[PDB]
């Protein structure tokens, strides 16, 4: 069904705004409203109110951090067509959204934003891999040591921590939660 | 059966309050009462009085029964109820609530969604904690010389403290603040 | 058969009191008497007189864990409430006069707390054992000046103290404070 | 469909310019427009508008290597020259007005240079990885006074910097200097 890009002034009037986690500073950067669906793109997630009837709505929430964006596509309108179509996959779920060709200028900005998000996520997955591999190379290099001047239990504690910090630091660095700056950059 | 979000002032009047562990500081943050069921969300657990007039009492502490797949469904023009769904442990819960009180059920949705996420992230951290302990065991395998029996005691203790401490940190028991953040 | 929660002052008048180990400071915290059975919950065990012969059973908590603690209320037409649990692997369902619900709900809370402590203890045992092994691995083949035979003795004592100490800590025998907390 | 090499001053008038990431300093170095398609070669990617709908494709060089760059001149009777290449695995053949041969030959040279740099980089990656391993092997099991946990951290950073650094060096993103060298 064909959708309308909503202006920022009318975000608070949208059904989707009730499900935005304003409490956690979640902010709406792009909203497309159709007769049957509402697609809300925030700094943290895609909030989607799915109408599977020609009036009840199923609420979905896909935080980017747990549901990566991939295969971002765009399709323009011909002379005879009334809509432009934007596509992507979030987690593994396929999204195809038809939008009033009048608002192409705006949908093209979303296309750019999503494309940039997908890439940052992709690159992050590559860095996680190196992060883990580096952890192993240390384990292998440092295997089989001597006591010398060593407090064994303290050293055992501290070593467990270093490993933890590295696995953790990298997990949160390369699975970033917030992509507001990406919408900020292209939605201007 | 269609339920009513109960007001805080009427929590001590509810059948579920008798099964809340007031002795351990358990506090009710959300209660939905229907003609057949009673669903009590405390800081520590879901307490469910289930009718199929007898009531079967279930208790699902969050620490041992993780919340997953938190869903919400709104009311159409013709419908009288909004539905909140989730899985606690493996059990599927679907609770119909008076559409009039949507403002409150949406807050529960947000709370549950936040708990589920915290628990998910904690599971991943446990994996890191365990994997890290192995990496030290490997790096420190086969040594030199040291007071062997004192070292043996102390080293066993570190391992224990590490395993235990992480177990309790990432399987947190209390989620009161999550309800407090979205309800109040 | 529908039972009656007995009052503390009438404990010494029950058939079950003859089988409580007063000599070891065993104290009755809850007794349900029916026309056929007698269920006696002490700090150390469930003593059950099963029936006009009676077969005596004793299930010390330390050797028979309590699990799957449930509760079931009465309907308008029912005269009883039912408390259920498994002790060791044995299934118990005990019908009690709905008039005494306030008391049976307390037993429910206590047994629930007992069961959880036992479960958590079984996890701690696992960490305790796993830690022992991690020191064995780290301390594997060493070197260094040392009184080998004394160190061998002392080392064997440490391992014994660890294994033993944790065995007694996480298979605790006495749960009197649990009953005390919820029956009080 | 026979295309036209567009002049730099008319780049901002092409449909493709709307999809260039000016915000990240992406600059168009070569644009061929046909009645159905639009091929836009930037420092970072091939942007292709495929056709009155147009499907937008973007193939950043860093994720889609250019290979098998070919060229085909016009015969007396032909109106076009054809430039071919594979990007990722996708086959591209682009017919262009034989009048503009002088320009398409420059694109040919640039794409040829891009493709070679990418190939050579894939060999360097292989050496970079193989070298990492040779240090792991040489540095396998050591001894010596040492702050084990700091050394473990620092060591893990080095490996990360090596893996990362080489990843970015040999999968370079920007090939603007290549176009600049042959279109100038």
Numbering used by the authors:
A (entry chain A): 14 to 67, 70 to 203
B (entry chain C): 14 to 65, 70 to 162, 165 to 203
C (entry chain B), D (entry chain B): 14 to 64, 70 to 161, 163 to 203
Task: Copy out sentences from the published article reporting this entry, exactly as the authors wrote them.
PHb1 and PHb2 share a common domain that is structurally similar to eukaryotic PH domains, which we have defined as a PHb domain (PH domain in bacteria).
A short helix at the C-terminus (α3) docks between α1 and the β2–β3 (L23) loop and, as a result, links the other end of the hairpin to the PHb domain. PHb2 is also a dome-shaped assembly, but with C12 cyclic symmetry that is generated by crystallographic C4 axis and a non-crystallographic C3 axis. The PHb2 assembly is significantly larger with an outer diameter of 150 Å, that is, twice that of PHb1(sl). The packing of hairpins involves the docking of surface hydrophobic residues of α1 (around Ile156) and α2 (Val167, Phe171, and Phe179) into a hydrophobic pocket formed by the adjacent hairpin of the neighboring protomer. However, only two main-chain hydrogen bonds [compared to five in PHb1(sl)] are formed between the two strands due to the separation at the N-terminus of β4 and C-terminus of β5 to accommodate the packing of the α1–α2 hairpins. On the other hand, the six independent protomers in the asu of PHb2 have similar packing environment and are essentially identical with each other in structure with an average rmsd of 0.27 Å for 180 aligned Cα atoms.
